[model samples]
Target: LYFQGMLAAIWAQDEQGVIGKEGKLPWHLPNDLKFFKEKTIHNTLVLGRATFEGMGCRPLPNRTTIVLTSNPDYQAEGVLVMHSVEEILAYADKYEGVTVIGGGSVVFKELIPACDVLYRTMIHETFEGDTFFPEIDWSVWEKVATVPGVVDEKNLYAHDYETYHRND
Candidate 1:
C-alpha cells in the first residue's frame, strides 16, 4: 500500500552544489541555520548517523529524529535508528512530512530521488568543499517558487530560497 504524506528534502549548497566540507558546512551562515530551524521545528528529520554526530550528537529539541545507518547495532540515546529506506518510510506516517536533512553521501544516495519536495538554498558563492550534492536529472523537478536572499552584515553571501516539487 502506498502511503500518502509529504516527503521533503532540505539543503543549503554552494554554487557548485557543495553542501559539506570534511563532515561539516564550509561556511557559517547563522541566517541559514535559523532558516533550517524554522522549517524543522515540530517536524521529523531523517538524516544519516554521521551527520547527526557531526552536529554534536544530540537530538534537536522538540522534533522527532530518525538516524539512518548501515550498522544494525548502531544506537543513539534519543532517536530512532534505522538501517534502510524502508525502515525510514515505515516510521514516516506519524508526521505530516518527513524532512530529509543530510550529509552529502546519504542525501545523494538515498533521499534526492525519493523526495516529493525539495527546499534548496542556492548560495551565490563557491567553496572548497570535499562533499558535493548529487547531479540529478532536472527534468524530474519543476520550480514552484523562490525567495531571494541577501548579503547582509552577517550573511556574507547572497542566496536564493528555492522550492520545487516532483514534476509529476
Candidate 2:
C-alpha cells in the first residue's frame, strides 16, 4: 500500500522452486544472469541482506540498490540498507519501478504478495538447495509472457522466463 510505482520481484529457481544452496545459486545459468541484468539495469533494485551478501556485497552498476536487513545498523557501500519492506516500498515510490531480486526465502514471503509483476526463471532440472522459494498463490497472478532459453554446453539445463502480472 505504500508504493506509487510498479513493484517487481525477480528470481530463478529449479522445478521444485529451489533457489539457493549455501547462500548462492544452485545452478549456473548464464542466460538467466543476462536476463536479470537486462531487466534490472538502471532500475531501483531491492535485495535482502543475504541476497546482497551472497553476491559478494557489491551493488550492480547503474542501479539504485536497496538492501533489506533486519539489523538496523547494517551498512554497505553504494547501497541503502533498510530494515523493513515498508521503507523499501516508500523509497520505491520515487522511482518509476523497483525490482526485488531474491536469494532468501523470508524476503520472498514478505514481498511476493505486494509485487505487481513477477519475473521468474524456471530451470527444468532440479538440484539440492538449502533454500526454497515461498509458495505462490497462483489465483492472483496471470502468466503474461514467456521466453525460452538457450541450451548448450555452458548452460546444460533447459530454462524459460515467465513473466506474471497480478490479476485484478
Candidate 3:
C-alpha cells in the first residue's frame, strides 16, 4: 500500500524524482557510516535510485554501490547500476553480505524478504513523515541481538539497535 502510493507519485514525475532533502530522514546518523566502515565495508550496498539521490551523488567511499533504477541515463561515477530488482539480486548474489538502504518504502518491501540479517535502530519516538520502513513479518525473523539504551544525538532519539536473522 505504501509502495503503491510512492511509486505512483514517483512515476508521475518527469524522471522519478522521489527523494527529498538529504538530512530529512530520521536517524540520518554519521555514526552509521562509522558502523558501516567497521563492519560492512567492502560489502555491496544495494539501494534504489531514490536512495542514491538522497545521498546527493556522493560515492559511499569504500563500498560498492548497486543502484536500482529504470532510467537509462542515471549514471554515476564508480557506482554499479541495474535496471531492476532481479538484476540487483543477480549482481549481489555472489557477494557475501549486502546492505539494502532506503529512501522510501519500495526498496525495503522488495528486499527485506531476501535479506539474511537486518540491522535496524528502532527509534522510541515515532516520526511523522511521508516515508516509513516496511512492516516486518516477525514470524519469519528472529531477533538475535538487542542493544538498548543508545541515544542518537543527531536525530535526538533514544533507540535500540536490533539485529534480526531469518529463521532457518
Q: Which candidate comes out best when scored by lDDT? A: 2
Residue 53 in candidate 2, Cα distance off native in Å = 1.4
Residues 1-168, candidate 1, lDDT per residue (tens digit)?
A: 113465677888999888887668899887787778877777788778767777766888888788888898988869888888877766665556555555456655576676787788899899998777777777999889899886788998889898888877
**Residue 93 miss distance in model 1 (angstroms):** 3.4
- Model 1 misplacement above 4 A: 1-4, 94-97
Instruction: After superposing candidate 3 on the true structure, give the runs of residues whose Cα lies further than 4 Å from its correct spot.
Output: 1-23, 96-104, 152-155
The candidate that achieves the highest TM-score relative to the unseen native structure: 2
lDDT of 3 by residue, 33-118 (tens): 45445544556666677767766767687777777788989899788888977776666555555544433457767766666666
lDDT, residue 28, candidate 1? 81
Better candidate number, 2 or 3, judged by lDDT: 2
Residue 167 displacement in candidate 3 (angstroms): 1.7
Candidate 2 local lDDT, 24-138, one digit each (tens): 9978988998998877887777888887888889988988888898897899988988899888777766776566555477888887887888889999999998888888687
When superposed on Cα atoms, how far off is each prediction in RMSD?
Answer: 2.9, 2.6, 8.9
Model 1 lDDT at residue 50:
67
